[PDB]
Amino acid sequence: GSQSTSNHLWLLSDILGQGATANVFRGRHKKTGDLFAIKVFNNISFLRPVDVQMREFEVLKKLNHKNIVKLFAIEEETTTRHKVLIMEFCPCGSLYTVLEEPSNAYGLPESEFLIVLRDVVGGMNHLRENGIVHRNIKPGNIMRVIGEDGQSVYKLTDFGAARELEDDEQFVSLYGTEEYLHPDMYERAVLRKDHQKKYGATVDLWSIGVTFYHAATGSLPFRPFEGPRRNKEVMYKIITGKPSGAISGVQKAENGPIDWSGDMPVSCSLSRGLQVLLTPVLANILEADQEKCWGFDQFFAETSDILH
């Protein structure tokens, strides 16, 4: 079967994404046949407080930029009367899928990496200008679109965890994805250690740092022997124990000691010149200590210098 709103229709088997609060479907405008991605909230999502439910709607109605997936319409699905989000369809899918390809085992080609850099920075700048935090940035929700000239353009999506947050404002609520998650959030959300901490916009810089390391090398920067998901204790030791300036930490052997590095791997796909410029960016955003990590002004200045 299918579901529909006044103007749009989607088959329930035409899935594009699956999540805690919502699924995304490939759907069509009824009259034109034009394709869209339609985000449809599940029952359990309505247990959230109303102001929380409204955030993604308010956030997306505020944004408009080439590095953010476009929102076309908000309409009401008929059987539930719930609002759905009707968004630009990106037929190429995500950066996650690009990174899975064998040719990218040791990182993206430098040309493609520089594009990811440009576009993630551009998206993040647009959010910050508009006082928005994302809180779940990762390759799985950075979408690839083929631009006018045949080259990639990447765009941020999945604003399910996003909110308006003034430049110095803090929050205590938990969102995100374990492999990409700032250590202070990981501490509470994954290890359940409550150390009475607050979090700020800079959580997005940590996830971007992890995303860039991943795009640059083909691997996540912080890796217990079993992978992050399967050894939460060691994952936490890697991310909280890392020396200042380190950008990666790996446990090579089961139950083994941890090795951290402040440089890119020897296998890194990027030119050595770029590696040398990238490494300080990563070191200063993969920095848990709020006293030492970069602010946004600087992150944008320092990456915009690399792009030129």
Ligand X SMILES: O=C(NCCCNc1nc(Nc2cccc(NC(=O)N3CCCC3)c2)ncc1I)c1cccs1
- Sites of contact with its own copies (CB under 8 A): 1, 12-18, 20, 26, 42-44, 47-48, 79-80, 91-93, 97, 100-102, 191-192, 226-227, 229-230, 232-233
> First CA to last CA across the chain, in angstroms?
51
**Applying CB under 6 A, which of residues 10, 25, 41, 89 lies at the interface with ligand X?**
89
Nearest approach, Cβ of residue 282 and its own copies (Å): 21
CA distance 35 to 8: 9
Nearest approach, Cβ of residue 277 and its own copies (Å): 27
Q: Contact 89/15 with Cβ under 8 angstroms?
A: no
**Which of 76/101 has CB closer to its own copies?**
101
Closest C-alpha among 209, 218, 212, 219 to residue 115: 212
Piece of the chain touching ligand X by CB under 6 A; list 7-15, 43-51, 121-129, 198-206: 7-15
Nearest approach, Cβ of residue 140 and ligand X (Å): 6
Q: Which residues of 24-39 are buried (b: 16+ CB within 10 A; e: fewer)?
A: bbbbbeeeeeeebbbb
Q: Contact 86/38 with Cβ under 8 angstroms?
A: yes
53 backbone dihedrals φ, ψ, rounded to 5°: -60, -35
Q: Is residue 109 involved in binding ligand X (CB under 6 A)?
A: no
**Applying CB under 6 A, which of residues 84, 86, 90, 235 lies at the interface with ligand X?**
90
Nearest approach, Cβ of residue 97 and its own copies (Å): 6
**Applying CB under 6 A, which of residues 16, 40, 116, 201 lies at the interface with ligand X?**
16
Nearest approach, Cβ of residue 161 and ligand X (Å): 10
**Which of 123/224 has CB closer to its own copies?**
224
Q: Is residue 74 involved in binding ligand X (CB under 6 A)?
A: no
Decide which of its own copies, ligand X, none touches 307; Cβ closer than 5 to 8 Å per partner kind. Answer: none
Full DSSP string of 13-69: EEEEEE-SSEEEEEEEETTT--EEEEEEE-GGGGGS-HHHHHHHHHHHHH---TTBP
**Applying CB under 6 A, which of residues 5, 67, 104, 141 lies at the interface with ligand X?**
141
Contacts of 276 (CB under 8 A, 6+ apart): none
Q: Contact 119/147 with Cβ under 8 angstroms?
A: no
Q: Is residue 13 involved in binding ligand X (CB under 6 A)?
A: yes
CA distance 37 to 94: 13
Calculate the CA 281 to chain-centre distance.
Answer: 17
Structure tokens at 185: 């959030």
Closest C-alpha among 76, 171, 84 to residue 132: 171
Piece of the chain touching ligand X by CB under 6 A; list 86-94, 108-116, 237-245, 249-257: 86-94
**Which of 103/271 has CB closer to its own copies?**
103
Site size toward ligand X, by CB under 6 A: 25
Decide which of its own copies, ligand X, none touches 230; Cβ closer than 5 to 8 Å per partner kind. Answer: its own copies
Q: Is residue 137 involved in binding ligand X (CB under 6 A)?
A: no
Structure tokens at 95: 């950066």
Q: What Rg, from alpha-carbon coordinates, does the chain have? A: 20
Chain residues that interact with ligand X, rule: CB under 6 A = 12-13, 15-19, 22-24, 37, 39, 69, 87, 89-91, 93-94, 97, 141, 143, 157-158, 160
